[PDB]
Symmetry: D3
């Protein structure tokens, strides 16, 4: 059954938006099957953002995801990857539709509160990267 | 500084109240310094409820608490143990005041949505039981 | 099992509080087993308020209660009568506790947004008065 | 003055979404002029869904609207038919815009929480089908 | 740093929507740097709506913004003019996207709850018109 | 008729709680008859807190209250002073009941989010201190 990775970023955590974000996913009927508050190491951040490593300001992108506690989480349900992407909305919070997490809360592209996997492929990669098998919980 | 332990129980998880509960702690200004979704083992459930092990409802407690995922968490702030207990309210949701978590959501004395340490000592025992030091996160 | 009667009064209806009120009962885990929007007749209003028919505010009660649509409802669950009364709070919203329906929304002793049966007997009388058996719905 | 028919489906009712849905319509300024909790008979369901009778899985569509209590309701206000359609959003909750009832709550096309009339024509037909004249209330 | 003018119109004020509107802007991370409850004079209304003076029903447009207290306010933050325009949504509340203030609350074009500046140019004009320099507050 | 004074303090402003606070007063049915964002001057802060000027925390009070913008407001309605005090709750948020403003949001006795007049006399003094007559708005 389909799963996606979500990270509540340090700005989401620091601004007290964790409950609000989770409620949106629970109201929508998804299952949290893994979740933890953590601090992301340098290495892990670079691995996570590997496809961005030759892009402008890579290190400001990394610096920021290591600048505070995040909530790492795996959601399960039908069309979860795609549905979570639409609930989160466009990377740029000015362009993200109203009613999306980024349209309603995000302050800028760099401070856009939350990440969700792009694709089936990147969900599987991000889930394996952040969680061991034993951290997944059945329900 | 002062820390308390909170558990969103399987009824709170299964009913989609994780976010709402977390939001009350965030709006209150507390800092989540550790958090995880988990399944509680038989042994962990018995150590946690050790004081009630001679009571005739002990199997009802244990079977319930290990029946689905819970969210375990550590909260930090001034008077956190006392303040969190007041926010959660009386064990029996029928007696819990309106505006408490148990008063607004609990459905029975056993299905009361959430637990919070009841003293300084209980908070130290419970945090030690549920978390290793490495799962604690400085902001 | 145990049932109580609830009426969202014409002020609650006219101010747009039906959903909010219903949501508190749903988040609390009660089952709505009968519900309807209605206009209360003169006769129904007098039978309902029969005990106050010698009081000098009786015309104020009756004219108010039959002045716009109400929502009549039957709620079911453990301790529902007592729990619903506590959720609704004291008759005079000035005395009702914060977090109650009357404490959060009521504007005067007469415009107090909502009624809930005050005992087992009162709940049986009121349900009988407002609903025929065929309007009861098993889940 | 324009009216539309809304049905909160059994999944909306069973998941405790009745207040939330009603609040969205009351915040938007519409009047509930009829409402009831009911169970839909086989006959009524088939009549309601008559235009679908030669389409795939008709009977799964019927089976489901009879599988639990629904809330039947008539809303009144300007552009109500069309405005309610946009508030409810696309039949498919994956495609329904964020901020719509189906985008925020719906789990699938079959479990999409709510129905609202398509057209002036089908509102008039659905209202007559579910309500007698005396169940409409003036305000 | 960019600023925009917002007016909560008399219908928004009269329907108790002031907190809700402000919360949407605070959740989005904007700063209120000026705000007041006031009554708009005839002169000020005509000046405010000067570009509409040769359009149909100008005086009904004016009559209405003078028919009750409004909240005048200046918001500051990045892309504030444009982001506030999208949060408020299309002038016509039937066409305004769900999740926008006008899509969720507005009853009609004339009763559309709220105004926000069109452009950098009209923000500067509307701010100067409603506020003296000393009413702006630094933070 | 009866009026009280309310101040959303700099913690309430800086944390993004203005709307939420205002919404509780609006849902309660009170009329805002004057309101403004302001910076409080040293002198205004000392006159307001005159009774505490010999207490060792007086500098902590004054420095805090003049440390960022506040929202000053006048609310009108039956029993407004008493009712608003109950809604706000006890000075020390640890003692304030759940469902109060201070109980749900206050983080310390000094950072308690909000002030409301404590008597009829105090309300007259405070309204006089913070507002000129011309800032009062009849609905």
């Amino acid at each position: 059954m389909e799963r996606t990775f979500v990270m509540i970023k340090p700005d989401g955590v620091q601004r007290g938006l964790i409950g609000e974000i989770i409620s949106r996913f629970e109201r929508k009927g998804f299952k949290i099957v893994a979740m933890k508050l953590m601090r992301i190491s340098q290495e892990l951040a670079e691995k996570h953002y590997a496809e961005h490593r030759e892009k402008p300001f890579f290190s400001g992108l990394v610096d920021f995801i290591t600048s505070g506690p995040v909530v790492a989480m795996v959601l399960e349900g039908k069309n979860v990857v795609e549905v979570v992407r639409k609930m989160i909305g466009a990377t740029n919070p000015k362009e993200a539709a109203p009613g999306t997490i980024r349209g309603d809360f995000g302050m800028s592209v760099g401070k856009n509160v939350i990440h969700g996997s792009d694709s089936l492929e990147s969900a599987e990669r991000e889930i394996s990267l952040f969680f061991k098998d034993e951290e997944l919980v059945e329900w």
